[PDB]
Amino acid sequence: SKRFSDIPQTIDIPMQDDVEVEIDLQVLPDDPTELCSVFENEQSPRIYWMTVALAYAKQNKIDFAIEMLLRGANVLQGNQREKLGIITCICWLYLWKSREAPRVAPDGVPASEAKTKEYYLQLATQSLNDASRINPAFPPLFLARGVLILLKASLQPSSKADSNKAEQLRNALKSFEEAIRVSQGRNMLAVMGKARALFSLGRYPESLAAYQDVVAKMPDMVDPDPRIGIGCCFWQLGFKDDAKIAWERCLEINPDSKHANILLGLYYLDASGHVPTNSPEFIRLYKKAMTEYTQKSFKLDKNLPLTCATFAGYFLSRKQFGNVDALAHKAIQYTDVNAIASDGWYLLARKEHYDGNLERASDYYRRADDARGGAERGYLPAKFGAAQLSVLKNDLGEAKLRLEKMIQHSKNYEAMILLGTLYAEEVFANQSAAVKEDKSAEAKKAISLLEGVRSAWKDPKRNLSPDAAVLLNLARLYESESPDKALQCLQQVEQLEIDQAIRKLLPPQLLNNIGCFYSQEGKHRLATEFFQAALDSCARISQTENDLDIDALLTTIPFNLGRSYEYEGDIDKAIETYEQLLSRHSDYTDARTRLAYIKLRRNPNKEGPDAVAKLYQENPSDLEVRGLYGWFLSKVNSKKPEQRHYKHTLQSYDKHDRYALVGMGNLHLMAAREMRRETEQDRQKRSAAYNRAVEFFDKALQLDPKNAYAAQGIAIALVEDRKDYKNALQIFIKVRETIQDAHVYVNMGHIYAELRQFSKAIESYEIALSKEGKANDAGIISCLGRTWLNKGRAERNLDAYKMALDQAKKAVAVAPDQLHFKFNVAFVQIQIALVLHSMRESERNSFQLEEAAEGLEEAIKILDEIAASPSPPYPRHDIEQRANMARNTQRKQLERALASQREYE
Amino acid sequence: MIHQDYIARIRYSNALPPPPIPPKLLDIPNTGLASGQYTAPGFASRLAREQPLNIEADAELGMPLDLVGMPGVFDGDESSIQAPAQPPPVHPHDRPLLRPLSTLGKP
Amino acid sequence: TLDPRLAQIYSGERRMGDRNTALRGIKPTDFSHVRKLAAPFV
């Protein structure tokens, strides 16, 4: 029946004398020590000892009851039949005391005389052993074994990666199963114990089956209610709504069930998780769960760990910390369960984190992690709190440790974003350091991490909150080598900024950079509009509160705008903007450097060289300005040691100025093809000069393997010093896809001309001529003409001689003064005459022969004039010799033209 | 003499571009780690909530088994903690709790 | 030879190309194998 219904109100103690002592078992003595003495001195029988002890238990005075039964035990040592009884009761009472005990007592414990759980457990073990030595196989002792083993098993700390606990659970199970066997399966506490063990073994369906069996066989067993077990089993197994049903039924039966209340609050808490953030539905569910069910349960027991932890979390959310400490502390002290301990430490950690006592916060996080077994298992949020706590204190190495450790465990979003940010910032810091370390690996790691974060924004299942900061960092990471991704990033940062045709005045820096990325692409007006938009945006900030260095941005951005105009073309406006920026701020030198270049192209003769000189003088140590001046000196050499001199003075200003080095390889190279070869010693001398050119080319290209100009200069070195066309051509092919300058194509055409690959040398040259700067470059037209001519020789192709003449005539049009160009049209005409004379009538036409004769006349004229001309390309007598053979070629062509049009009859 | 041919001086050039001096990137103000947002507890509060709840109150799981007070057990009889010979009719509110796991559907 | 004001104005600036980066061309490429063949040159 009901527990304690057994006890009567009053009883009479049979004294040695009589009638004697009567006792009220509802309102007992405040101390039983005397009564114990009475019973000792009365050799008192054993029912009285038990009746009074259990009486003390009914009004919660459990120790009294223990003490009584301790003395009763020793008083009846001769007889073991009820000794067995009281010793078993002792054991069970030691389990009770065990339950209300603490894991550990305060630091002034003292550790011996520890009132701890393990103290009562060990005491229960001994008493139990005493009773089993009397009668092993007394059913209540089979129960006792089970229970004990459970209570001891729960105290096993979390293992890493347990076998100790698992086996202990098995032992409990077998003891509970023995208690069942002995009862022939009618002991419901034994089967409840078995169910518990199964649940601890993760055998949930059998555990459920067991609690259900209890309810089925014995519904009125409600102390303890197995329906709790039912609910817990349902919840694991993933049926939290049926768990709800069970625990509501638990409460229906007993609304003051302190565990059913918590469990129901936990149901609603979980439910409040599945609904969003703060909402009407969320708030009702959360206040319901916490206030109703957890408070209710807390009023019933202030010392109930799960409740304590849960309500500590409640207060945490409401930033009310005196409560949080007390509760969470209480929970940690009084718990059989590690999970609870870890949750308590975690709550305290988050409190001390908020308030800022980081050392004890980090220790707390650590204890929270370890409670669940620490590393390789543990509490993910606790680990994270540690990582953050280590990030502060600036001990960023260890932060890197644990975050890595975590992402290796699982792709946790919060780890990924923090680690990636950490790496990004490492790279950014590096770049302004005294010595740039190599952090390309750390950069990659960052990029990958924040792209993994982008994946997190992508997948519908997560709730998908987006961060600016991540996008900006990622934009900067990509900036150096993968700029288009950086652009896209900044475009989506644009969108996020605007959300919170198109007129856009967002912060200036964002707009500028976007402008910059647009500018690296062709979109120079899009860029220009973005710069203008940035300026406007700075003006808007200027009027209002926020102080940014608006004067700095109003120096930088208008340069960018001038540069963009310049890119775009309305250079005059570029000029005026540079100038306006200069009027307000004339010491911003990059502006005037662009001005001087704008000038160098507009007025090559006059103001430009004036302007650059002035800029070199007024501003002689700016490496960009320098480069420009050197570029200017190169133009003067083309016009032809001022340039080499200067480049290595600059070389004393900076050892690794790639521009100047390739400037040297170039200068050497040019000066050294014209070096008198003579032969022998003289010939060697210049091959040393090429060596020096390659000296400079290689150092330059070793600093910057991406440098195409240095590599191409090595290909030129190749071709000229060691006629290695084949690989020099390799260099040329992949420099060609990166450079696009005319001279690249010219140099290519030169190689292909050598390699008999005429067609491909043709349209190399053709592409060169297409290109801005002169289409009509005489020297390229010449080279193209001869290439065509050699193609005509090779292939027996008239049309190729046709083209060679056409080209030779295009050149003559351009420079009609020029002696040789005239010789060339002439030579080619004589060749066409020749080849046409060699051909068979079967493959020839009479029209062709007329035009050839015409051309030949032209040729004789040109050659004849050249003979008379001073400074002839070849000796004049050799030119006359060519003309004299042109008299008998005249007749060859006469003859065969007659023969041909007769064939044409 | 007859070694005359098309005349086209043949030279290679590697002229450098003038320093472009492109536009200049500006530093976009951002929330660092030093700015507390990423190191604040708050940022972890979502991550903390989506963690599964522990529903294990005790070693005994909130159903504490003690025989203490149970009328005869320390003497011979487990009557108090023994199921009746005749199973009682099932209460309507226990019917849903008695449903076999199979009957429950899919998790 | 920077004025203090200029020096801090430049502080905010980050270059995205210069003399040297220009020589890498419109799309960078590795030319260290060319380094290999400059080597036997000298």
Is the residue at A107 inside a domain? no
d(CA A804, CA A798): 10
Cβ neighbours around A651 below 10 Å, total: 17
Identify residues of C whose CB sits under 8 angstroms from chain B CBs.
12-19, 22-23
Contact A747 B81 (CB under 8 A): no
Instruction: Inform me whether the C-beta atom of residue B102 falls under 8 Å from chain A C-beta atoms.
Output: no
| Among candidates B7, B25, B94 on the partner chain, residue whose Cβ is nearest the Cβ of A820 | B7
Instruction: Inform me whether the C-beta atom of residue B77 falls under 8 Å from chain A C-beta atoms.
Output: no
Contact C17 B20 (CB under 8 A): yes
**Burial classification of residue A461, based on how many CB atoms lie within 10 Å of its CB (0-12 exposed, 13-18 middle, 19 or more buried):** exposed
Cβ neighbours around A209 below 10 Å, total: 15
User: Three-class SS of residue A88?
Assistant: helix
Which residues neighbour B44 within 8 Å (Cβ) at sequence distance 6 or greater?
A: A350, A381, A384, A385, A388, A414
Q: Which of A301, A331, A365 is the last residue of a domain?
A: A301
Contact C15 B25 (CB under 8 A): yes
d(CA A18, CA A283): 69
Instruction: Inform me whether the C-beta atom of residue B9 falls under 8 Å from chain A C-beta atoms.
Output: yes
| End-to-end Cα spacing for chain B | 102
* A809, containing H or E segment: helix A798-814
Contact A537, A505 (CB under 8 A): yes
Contact A598, A553 (CB under 8 A): no
- Chosen from C15, C23, C26, C34 to mutate, greatest number of chain B CBs within 10 A: C15
d(CA A339, CA B53): 10
For A418, name the nearest residue in chain B, comparing CA atoms only. Answer: B38
Cβ neighbours around A437 below 10 Å, total: 11
Provide the token pair at A486.
Answer: 């950086």
Alpha carbon of residue A373 to chain centroid: 29
Which residues neighbour B98 within 8 Å (Cβ) at sequence distance 6 or greater?
A: A212, A215, A216, B90
Instruction: Inform me whether the C-beta atom of residue A371 falls under 8 Å from chain B C-beta atoms.
Output: no
| B1: chain A residues, CB-CB within 8 Å | 878, 881
**Burial classification of residue A266, based on how many CB atoms lie within 10 Å of its CB (0-12 exposed, 13-18 middle, 19 or more buried):** buried
Q: What is the DSSP letter of A13?
A: E
Resolution expressed in Å:
2.9
- C-contacting residues in A 816-875 (Cβ below 8 Å): none
CB pairs under 8 A between B and C: 28
Provide the token pair at A832.
Answer: 């066409």
User: Three-class SS of residue A11?
Assistant: strand
Contact A657 C34 (CB under 8 A): no
Q: Which of A301, A317, A348 is the last residue of a domain?
A: A301
Instruction: Inform me whether the C-beta atom of residue B103 falls under 8 Å from chain A C-beta atoms.
Output: no
Tokens 């004339």 sit on residue? A586
- C-contacting residues in A 654-683 (Cβ below 8 Å): 657-659, 662
Contact A716, A747 (CB under 8 A): yes
Q: CA-based diameter of chain B, in Å? A: 140
Considering Cα of A852, then A854, then A860, then A865, what sign does the dihedral take?
negative
| Among candidates A232, A638, A881 on the partner chain, residue whose Cβ is nearest the Cβ of B55 | A232
Number of folded domains that form chain A: 2
Q: Report phi then psi at B82, rounded to 5.
A: -115, 135
Instruction: Inform me whether the C-beta atom of residue B98 falls under 8 Å from chain A C-beta atoms.
Output: yes
Q: What is the DSSP letter of A395?
A: -
**Burial classification of residue A621, based on how many CB atoms lie within 10 Å of its CB (0-12 exposed, 13-18 middle, 19 or more buried):** exposed
Contact A581, B24 (CB under 8 A): no
Q: What is the DSSP letter of C14?
A: E
Q: Report phi then psi at A644, rounded to 5.
A: -65, -40
Instruction: Inform me whether the C-beta atom of residue A249 falls under 8 Å from chain B C-beta atoms.
Output: yes
Cβ neighbours around A140 below 10 Å, total: 24
Radius of gyration of chain B (CA): 44
| C17: chain B residues, CB-CB within 8 Å | 20-22
Is the residue at A283 inside a domain? yes
Instruction: Inform me whether the C-beta atom of residue B92 falls under 8 Å from chain A C-beta atoms.
Output: no
Instruction: Inform me whether the C-beta atom of residue B58 falls under 8 Å from chain A C-beta atoms.
Output: yes
d(CA C30, CA A327): 65
Alpha carbon of residue C27 to chain centroid: 14
**Following DSSP, what letter does each residue of A218-261 receive, concatenated?**
-TT--TT-THHHHHHHHHTTT-HHHHHHHHHHHHHH-TT-HHHH
| Among candidates A624, A662, A706 on the partner chain, residue whose Cβ is nearest the Cβ of C29 | A706
Q: Residues for chain C: how many in total?
A: 42
Contact B26 C17 (CB under 8 A): no
CA angle B2, B4, B10 (to 5 degrees): 150
User: Three-class SS of residue A24?
Assistant: strand
Alpha carbon of residue A521 to chain centroid: 26
d(CA A254, CA A258): 9
H helices then E strands: how many in chain A? 43, 2
Closest C-alpha to A308, from A336, A289, A327? A327
Alpha carbon of residue A89 to chain centroid: 63
Subunits with at least 3 CB pairs below 8 A relative to chain C? A, B
Contact B61 A153 (CB under 8 A): no
What are the distances in angstroms from CA A475 to CA A487, A672, A705, B84, C18?
7, 47, 25, 75, 20
Which residues neighbour A624 within 8 Å (Cβ) at sequence distance 6 or greater?
A: A590, A593, B19, B21, C18, C19
Q: Are strands A21-24 and A10-13 parallel, antiparallel or unpaired?
A: antiparallel
Q: Residues for chain A: how many in total?
A: 905
Instruction: Inform me whether the C-beta atom of residue A344 falls under 8 Å from chain B C-beta atoms.
Output: no
d(CA A572, CA A578): 10
Instruction: Inform me whether the C-beta atom of residue A707 falls under 8 Å from chain B C-beta atoms.
Output: no
Closest Cα in chain C, distance from residue B9 (Å): 26
Tokens 């810091």 sit on residue? A429
Instruction: Inform me whether the C-beta atom of residue B32 falls under 8 Å from chain A C-beta atoms.
Output: yes
| C17: chain A residues, CB-CB within 8 Å | 520
Q: What is the DSSP letter of B10?
A: -
Range of the domain at A221: 202-301
Is the residue at A594 inside a domain? no
d(CA A7, CA A54): 8
Provide the token pair at A268.
Answer: 């609603």
Is the residue at A229 inside a domain? yes
Instruction: Inform me whether the C-beta atom of residue A92 falls under 8 Å from chain B C-beta atoms.
Output: yes
For B14, name the nearest residue in chain C, comparing CA atoms only. Answer: C23
Helix axes A46-58 and A81-100, enclosed angle (nearest 10): 20
Q: What is the DSSP letter of B67?
A: -
Contact A147, B68 (CB under 8 A): no
Subunits with at least 3 CB pairs below 8 A relative to chain A? B, C
Contact B9 A219 (CB under 8 A): no
Contact B27, A313 (CB under 8 A): no
d(CA A99, CA A76): 28
Instruction: Inform me whether the C-beta atom of residue B89 falls under 8 Å from chain A C-beta atoms.
Output: no
* B25, containing H or E segment: strand B25-26
Closest C-alpha to A706, from C24, B25, C37? C24
Which residues neighbour A386 within 8 Å (Cβ) at sequence distance 6 or greater?
A: A362, A365, A366, A369, A402
Radius of gyration of chain C (CA): 18
Is the residue at A210 inside a domain? yes
Contact A697 C8 (CB under 8 A): no
| Among candidates A516, A627, A738 on the partner chain, residue whose Cβ is nearest the Cβ of C25 | A738
| A698: chain C residues, CB-CB within 8 Å | 35, 38-39, 41-42
Contact A714 C25 (CB under 8 A): no
Which residues neighbour A111 within 8 Å (Cβ) at sequence distance 6 or greater?
A: none
Provide the token pair at A548.
Answer: 């940014």
Is the residue at A263 inside a domain? yes
Which residues neighbour A808 within 8 Å (Cβ) at sequence distance 6 or greater?
A: A782, A785, A821, A824, A825, A827, A828, B6
Beta bridge partners of A21: A13
Query: How many alpha carbons fall within 13 Å on the CB side of residue A303?
Result: 7
Q: What is the DSSP letter of A157?
A: P
**Following DSSP, what letter does each residue of A588-625 receive, concatenated?**
-HHHHHHHHHHHHHH-TTTHHHHHHHHHHHHSTT-HHH
Contact A460, A434 (CB under 8 A): no
Which residues neighbour A47 within 8 Å (Cβ) at sequence distance 6 or greater?
A: none
Is the residue at A833 inside a domain? yes
H helices then E strands: how many in chain B? 2, 1
**Following DSSP, what letter does each residue of A690-753 receive, concatenated?**
HHHHHHHHHHHHHH-TT-HHHHHHHHHHHHHHS--HHHHHHHHHHHHHHH--HHHHHHHHHHHH
Contact A187, A177 (CB under 8 A): no
Considering Cα of A350, then A351, then A355, then A360, what sign does the dihedral take?
negative
Which residues neighbour A668 within 8 Å (Cβ) at sequence distance 6 or greater?
A: A644, A689, A690, A692, A693, A696
Cβ neighbours around A897 below 10 Å, total: 18
Q: List b or e across A805-817, with b for residues whose CB sees 16 or more CB atoms inside 10 angstroms.
A: bbbbbbbbebbee
Q: Report phi then psi at A687, rounded to 5.
A: -65, -20
What are the distances in angstroms from CA A553 to CA A509, A542, A550, A590, C12?
8, 11, 5, 15, 9
What are the distances in angstroms from CA B14 to CA A311, A601, A670, B104?
78, 19, 9, 81
Contact A224 B65 (CB under 8 A): yes
Contact A288, A275 (CB under 8 A): no
Helix axes A508-520 and A483-499, enclosed angle (nearest 10): 150
CB pairs under 8 A between A and B: 338
Contact C22 B25 (CB under 8 A): no
Q: What is the DSSP letter of B101?
A: G
For A626, name the nearest residue in chain B, comparing CA atoms only. Answer: B19
Is the residue at A900 inside a domain? yes
Q: CA-based diameter of chain A, in Å? A: 173
**Following DSSP, what letter does each residue of A536-575 receive, concatenated?**
HHHHHHHHSS----HHHHHHHHHHHHHHHHHHHS-HHHHH
Strands (DSSP E) along A752-805, which ranges? none
| Cis amide leading into A110 (omega within 30) | yes
Subunits with at least 3 CB pairs below 8 A relative to chain B? A, C
What are the distances in angstroms from CA A464 to CA A451, A458, A459, A540, B78?
14, 7, 8, 33, 59
| Among candidates B16, B19, B22 on the partner chain, residue whose Cβ is nearest the Cβ of C16 | B22
Closest C-alpha to B14, from C19, A670, C30? A670
Question: What is the domain-level CATH number for residue A234?
Answer: 1.25.40.10
Closest C-alpha to A95, from A141, A56, A137, A53? A141
For A247, name the nearest residue in chain B, comparing CA atoms only. Answer: B97
Contact A183 B82 (CB under 8 A): yes
Q: What is the DSSP letter of A187?
A: B
d(CA A10, CA A699): 109
CA angle A140, A146, A152 (to 5 degrees): 130
Instruction: Inform me whether the C-beta atom of residue A148 falls under 8 Å from chain B C-beta atoms.
Output: no
Cβ neighbours around A329 below 10 Å, total: 16
**Following DSSP, what letter does each residue of A489-537 receive, concatenated?**
HHHHHHHHHHH--------HHHHHHHHHHHHHSS-HHHHHHHHHHHHHH
Radius of gyration of chain A (CA): 50
Q: Which of A301, A316, A347 is the last residue of a domain?
A: A301
| C23: chain B residues, CB-CB within 8 Å | 16-17
